[PDB]
Design an enzyme around this catalytic site. Sequence first.
Site, mmCIF file in Angstrom:
data_model
loop_
_atom_site.group_PDB
_atom_site.id
_atom_site.type_symbol
_atom_site.label_atom_id
_atom_site.label_comp_id
_atom_site.label_asym_id
_atom_site.label_seq_id
_atom_site.Cartn_x
_atom_site.Cartn_y
_atom_site.Cartn_z
ATOM 1 N N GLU A 82 -31.871 -9.555 -0.261
ATOM 2 C CA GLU A 82 -30.924 -10.669 -0.181
ATOM 3 C C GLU A 82 -31.606 -11.890 0.436
ATOM 4 O O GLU A 82 -31.429 -12.221 1.611
ATOM 5 C CB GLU A 82 -29.691 -10.255 0.617
ATOM 6 C CG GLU A 82 -29.006 -8.984 0.117
ATOM 7 C CD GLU A 82 -29.438 -7.726 0.870
ATOM 8 O OE1 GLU A 82 -30.616 -7.626 1.273
ATOM 9 O OE2 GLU A 82 -28.588 -6.831 1.063
ATOM 10 N N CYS B 169 -21.753 6.674 23.616
ATOM 11 C CA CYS B 169 -21.381 7.507 24.749
ATOM 12 C C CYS B 169 -21.525 6.817 26.099
ATOM 13 O O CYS B 169 -20.995 7.330 27.091
ATOM 14 C CB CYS B 169 -22.200 8.807 24.762
ATOM 15 S SG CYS B 169 -23.834 8.684 25.526
ATOM 16 N N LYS C 289 -26.385 1.972 10.375
ATOM 17 C CA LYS C 289 -27.224 2.203 9.206
ATOM 18 C C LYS C 289 -28.437 1.286 9.289
ATOM 19 O O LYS C 289 -28.286 0.060 9.378
ATOM 20 C CB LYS C 289 -26.448 1.956 7.912
ATOM 21 C CG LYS C 289 -27.312 1.946 6.662
ATOM 22 C CD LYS C 289 -26.453 1.738 5.424
ATOM 23 C CE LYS C 289 -27.303 1.596 4.167
ATOM 24 N NZ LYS C 289 -26.422 1.529 2.965
ATOM 25 N N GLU D 183 0.831 -1.200 0.000
ATOM 26 C CA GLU D 183 0.000 0.000 0.000
ATOM 27 C C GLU D 183 0.865 1.250 0.000
ATOM 28 O O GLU D 183 1.725 1.415 0.870
ATOM 29 C CB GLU D 183 -0.946 0.022 1.202
ATOM 30 C CG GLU D 183 -1.673 1.350 1.405
ATOM 31 C CD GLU D 183 -2.367 1.867 0.150
ATOM 32 O OE1 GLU D 183 -3.104 1.094 -0.500
ATOM 33 O OE2 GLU D 183 -2.162 3.055 -0.189
HETATM 34 C C1 LIG Z 1 -18.402 9.967 -4.949
HETATM 35 C C2 LIG Z 1 -18.383 8.486 -4.654
HETATM 36 C C3 LIG Z 1 -19.173 7.960 -3.645
HETATM 37 C C4 LIG Z 1 -19.153 6.595 -3.368
HETATM 38 N N1 LIG Z 1 -19.945 6.089 -2.390
HETATM 39 C C5 LIG Z 1 -19.945 4.763 -2.117
HETATM 40 C C6 LIG Z 1 -20.783 4.161 -1.049
HETATM 41 O O1 LIG Z 1 -21.539 4.851 -0.345
HETATM 42 N N2 LIG Z 1 -20.712 2.844 -0.843
HETATM 43 C C7 LIG Z 1 -19.910 2.052 -1.574
HETATM 44 O O2 LIG Z 1 -19.919 0.833 -1.333
HETATM 45 N N3 LIG Z 1 -19.109 2.517 -2.560
HETATM 46 C C8 LIG Z 1 -19.075 3.831 -2.866
HETATM 47 N N4 LIG Z 1 -18.246 4.322 -3.882
HETATM 48 C C9 LIG Z 1 -17.366 3.415 -4.620
HETATM 49 C C10 LIG Z 1 -16.146 3.152 -3.712
HETATM 50 O O3 LIG Z 1 -15.550 4.391 -3.292
HETATM 51 C C11 LIG Z 1 -15.105 2.269 -4.396
HETATM 52 O O4 LIG Z 1 -15.808 1.213 -5.046
HETATM 53 C C12 LIG Z 1 -14.086 1.617 -3.451
HETATM 54 O O5 LIG Z 1 -13.302 2.574 -2.724
HETATM 55 C C13 LIG Z 1 -13.130 0.729 -4.240
HETATM 56 O O6 LIG Z 1 -12.098 0.253 -3.378
HETATM 57 P P1 LIG Z 1 -10.758 -0.412 -3.956
HETATM 58 O O7 LIG Z 1 -10.038 -1.090 -2.810
HETATM 59 O O8 LIG Z 1 -11.037 -1.196 -5.228
HETATM 60 O O9 LIG Z 1 -9.874 0.848 -4.428
HETATM 61 P P2 LIG Z 1 -9.395 2.069 -3.479
HETATM 62 O O10 LIG Z 1 -10.207 2.059 -2.211
HETATM 63 O O11 LIG Z 1 -9.318 3.286 -4.363
HETATM 64 O O12 LIG Z 1 -7.901 1.631 -3.094
HETATM 65 C C14 LIG Z 1 -6.859 1.599 -4.064
HETATM 66 C C15 LIG Z 1 -5.560 1.617 -3.280
HETATM 67 O O13 LIG Z 1 -4.445 1.300 -4.111
HETATM 68 C C16 LIG Z 1 -3.345 2.096 -3.672
HETATM 69 N N5 LIG Z 1 -2.348 2.188 -4.756
HETATM 70 C C17 LIG Z 1 -2.501 2.822 -5.934
HETATM 71 N N6 LIG Z 1 -1.389 2.681 -6.698
HETATM 72 C C18 LIG Z 1 -0.506 1.937 -5.997
HETATM 73 C C19 LIG Z 1 0.868 1.417 -6.209
HETATM 74 N N7 LIG Z 1 1.536 1.666 -7.360
HETATM 75 N N8 LIG Z 1 1.430 0.682 -5.219
HETATM 76 C C20 LIG Z 1 0.776 0.423 -4.069
HETATM 77 N N9 LIG Z 1 -0.467 0.870 -3.807
HETATM 78 C C21 LIG Z 1 -1.144 1.620 -4.716
HETATM 79 C C22 LIG Z 1 -3.953 3.423 -3.259
HETATM 80 O O14 LIG Z 1 -3.100 4.073 -2.312
HETATM 81 C C23 LIG Z 1 -5.294 2.991 -2.677
HETATM 82 O O15 LIG Z 1 -5.266 2.832 -1.250
HETATM 83 C C24 LIG Z 1 -18.263 5.705 -4.160
HETATM 84 C C25 LIG Z 1 -17.457 6.234 -5.162
HETATM 85 C C26 LIG Z 1 -17.490 7.597 -5.432
HETATM 86 C C27 LIG Z 1 -16.629 8.190 -6.517
HETATM 87 C C1 LIG Z 2 -32.996 -9.314 4.096
HETATM 88 C C2 LIG Z 2 -32.543 -8.108 4.933
HETATM 89 C C3 LIG Z 2 -31.016 -8.186 5.078
HETATM 90 C C4 LIG Z 2 -32.866 -6.864 4.143
HETATM 91 N N1 LIG Z 2 -32.263 -6.549 2.947
HETATM 92 C C5 LIG Z 2 -32.802 -5.362 2.482
HETATM 93 C C6 LIG Z 2 -32.538 -4.645 1.323
HETATM 94 C C7 LIG Z 2 -33.249 -3.481 1.110
HETATM 95 CL CL1 LIG Z 2 -32.952 -2.568 -0.345
HETATM 96 C C8 LIG Z 2 -34.194 -3.021 2.014
HETATM 97 C C9 LIG Z 2 -34.446 -3.747 3.166
HETATM 98 C C10 LIG Z 2 -33.758 -4.929 3.419
HETATM 99 C C11 LIG Z 2 -33.778 -5.903 4.471
HETATM 100 C C12 LIG Z 2 -34.594 -5.918 5.727
HETATM 101 C C13 LIG Z 2 -34.660 -7.301 6.391
HETATM 102 C C14 LIG Z 2 -35.769 -8.241 5.899
HETATM 103 N N2 LIG Z 2 -35.666 -9.503 6.637
HETATM 104 C C15 LIG Z 2 -36.871 -9.951 7.344
HETATM 105 C C16 LIG Z 2 -36.394 -11.135 8.169
HETATM 106 C C17 LIG Z 2 -34.936 -10.817 8.488
HETATM 107 C C18 LIG Z 2 -34.669 -9.503 7.732
HETATM 108 C C19 LIG Z 2 -33.273 -9.342 7.097
HETATM 109 C C20 LIG Z 2 -33.250 -8.011 6.324
HETATM 110 C C21 LIG Z 2 -34.918 -8.244 8.564
HETATM 111 O O1 LIG Z 2 -35.096 -8.246 9.773
HETATM 112 N N3 LIG Z 2 -34.913 -7.128 7.826
HETATM 113 CL CL LIG Z 3 -26.892 2.175 0.137
HETATM 114 ZN ZN LIG Z 4 -25.124 8.244 23.575
#
Ligand SMILES: Cc1cc2nc3c(=O)[nH]c(=O)nc-3n(C[C@H](O)[C@H](O)[C@H](O)COP(=O)(O)OP(=O)(O)OC[C@H]3O[C@@H](n4cnc5c(N)ncnc54)[C@H](O)[C@@H]3O)c2cc1C
Ligand SMILES: CC1(C)c2[nH]c3cc(Cl)ccc3c2C[C@@]23CN4CCC[C@]4(C[C@@H]12)C(=O)N3
Ligand SMILES: [Cl-]
Ligand SMILES: [Zn+2]
Length: 664
Positions: free
Chosen positions: A492, A614, A106, A68
Amino acid sequence: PTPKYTFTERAAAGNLSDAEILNSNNPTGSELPDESDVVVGGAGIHGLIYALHASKYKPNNLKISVIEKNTRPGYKIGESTLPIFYTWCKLHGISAAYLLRLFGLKDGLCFYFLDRENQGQYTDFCSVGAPGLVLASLQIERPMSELLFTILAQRNGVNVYHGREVDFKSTVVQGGGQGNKIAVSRGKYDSTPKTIDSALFVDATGRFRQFCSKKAPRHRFDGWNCNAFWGYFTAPKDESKIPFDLYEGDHTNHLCFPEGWVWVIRLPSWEGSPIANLMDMVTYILECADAGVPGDELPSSEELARMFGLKFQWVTSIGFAVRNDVKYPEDLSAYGTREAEQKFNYFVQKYELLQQFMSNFELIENLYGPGTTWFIRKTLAYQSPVVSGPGWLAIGDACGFTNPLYSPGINVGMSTSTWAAQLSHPIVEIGKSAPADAAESSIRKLLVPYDDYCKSLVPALEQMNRFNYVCYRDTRLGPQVACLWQFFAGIERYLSDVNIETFAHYAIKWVWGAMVPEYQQVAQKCIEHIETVPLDERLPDAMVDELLAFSNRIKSAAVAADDFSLRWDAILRSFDRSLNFVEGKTSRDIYTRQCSGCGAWLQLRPDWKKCHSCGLLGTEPQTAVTFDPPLTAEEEALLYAAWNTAPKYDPSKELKLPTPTRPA
Ligand SMILES: Cc1cc2nc3c(=O)[nH]c(=O)nc-3n(C[C@H](O)[C@H](O)[C@H](O)COP(=O)(O)OP(=O)(O)OC[C@H]3O[C@@H](n4cnc5c(N)ncnc54)[C@H](O)[C@@H]3O)c2cc1C
Ligand SMILES: CC1(C)c2[nH]c3cc(Cl)ccc3c2C[C@@]23CN4CCC[C@]4(C[C@@H]12)C(=O)N3
Ligand SMILES: [Cl-]
Ligand SMILES: [Zn+2]
Ligand SMILES: CC1(C)c2[nH]c3cc(Cl)ccc3c2C[C@@]23CN4CCC[C@]4(C[C@@H]12)C(=O)N3
């Protein structure tokens, strides 16, 4: 367990840099090994998920080193995670009581759809998560998640080296079992790089595509792409002045409109904490998870910050993800001095609901260091045409990416990380057990399904993203078509049966439901109609009627064909048990509450009487999970029993898929 301060004291005794105290926790040592089985370039979330899943799937088989570039786990956008991710953490030995000390709770997803031509009007789509005795979802600060997985990896025979960079100019990657020579330095300036002789290289360098870009040009999809700009804000204790009815901060909230949408994610931040102290806190949490310390006897987040000398605060991540065919005014200097700030504040004042919303939040300056008050990233979606070859494969963002919406990046992307992890064992053994030509041919054929899955994965996610975006142009299509179909196709099913052995197989069949035929059928009808209306125009009311009627007709048949029992009216606030839209419905299960002391959102269960953040004690709403419609005492006991422990691996049992049942 009594807390130990091993790393804090080791760092002070040797005046160690950030990378040196991290690398000192490696099982093989602080310096790079001469040889390894697998070298992973990049310790983002996917490089670490890969190394964790590979060692857990079959322990003591592969020597794995992760390289990294960052000196310590760096800032990343991408904070919202889904039930499949938590299930994976739980399968790897960290359940919600421990994760909630580090990350934010969440509970479901909520969407608000703003009418552009009738300012002030909005509709919504709200869902709940799960009871505290079922599962949790997490909002994760990425420097903390990467640290957690680094320490967990180092405790499971994986070496992780921060402050080290793979030199892709001099690195040699070859096929068969012939051997890679991965060149590792501390940067361009370092003229004494090291070489790791190894069998398999894993490209986990994210969107930088540092290796697979050498094998194919980056691929873009037809049509508009998206841009994002974002910042970090305070997290108000009192959410009652937010202008959306029934708003709750512990969802991933989405403010949706014709041009795009805004994410709102409440999460704790550990910024300002020394890295050595954080290692001690994380190590303590893992020792507690190993010992099974109950939640009420586990120190709270703020207590941990006091014990280990950390900084802790609540923040809100707020960002825009909008289409790149939006027309901006030429001069935006009135809204700030940087482009990210300018476009953020310009868009806020385009919608009165967004401005009234944002007036509950105070901007945080430079939360992640200088120059980090504002972020911008343009042209989000892409795909890598080649994701494997002789001596290497790619995972995570290095394969492709679409959009933050519904968080496919971490939660869908971990299907590739975990499948590659499983495939890595036979890949390495083939090369150690057969001559070079046959080895390479056998590895090539083994990876054909991995290549084919990746190839079709990103286009399916891209169509899913366009589907939601076009429906966000109307306050009926958004909740009643797009949201409804994503939840029905993508919930799921049978997640409680997944174990380490089946995880990858299950995950690659999920895809957020984006491969479900009826989902794609409705998505293509909406996209085909709405893309013909210029963005600056309102959708004709007759187009909404027709798309709504078409969607509901396809829905009724697909819902009747699903054989999975689910209290739909308890999960979706606006829908009955048969997933019919109900205009005035507000009834839903209640799984969470807000701590009156610190504002943190908590899961309701009888054995968690105190706030996990807390430490303040509660008075009986934890036993007050509200099931609506109600569940008997036996039904509730039966629900919790299903989710207690994942079943042992039974190779006689067939894997039940997450997607709806085929109509036959
Ligand atoms: C605006 C935005 C919002 C997002 N929100 C969400 C969200 O809410 N939920 C979600 O699941 N996903 C979200 N994503 C997508 C998510 O950010 C990426 O899918 C995720 O970070 C991918 O992780 P990764 O490990 O593949 O790459 P990264 O997390 O980018 O890691 C790549 C790593 O490689 C390292 N690296 C690079 N080059 C080298 C080298 N030459 N040598 C050694 N190390 C190197 C870097 O330092 C870096 O740490 C979002 C993306 C964007 C743009
Ligand atoms: C399947 C799960 C992970 C789920 N996946 C989602 C995706 C979206 Cl996009 C929205 C809501 C859910 C939920 C809510 C659920 C519904 N299931 C009823 C029995 C157990 C469980 C697991 C859980 C529950 O208690 N809540
Ligand atoms: Cl989400
Ligand atoms: Zn509290
Ligand atoms: C479905 C198959 C072809 C499969 N498809 C995968 C996809 C991924 Cl991504 C990973 C593993 C598999 C497997 C291995 C399986 C799992 N099934 C359990 C019952 C019968 C069967 C068939 C077989 C079995 O014995 N082994």
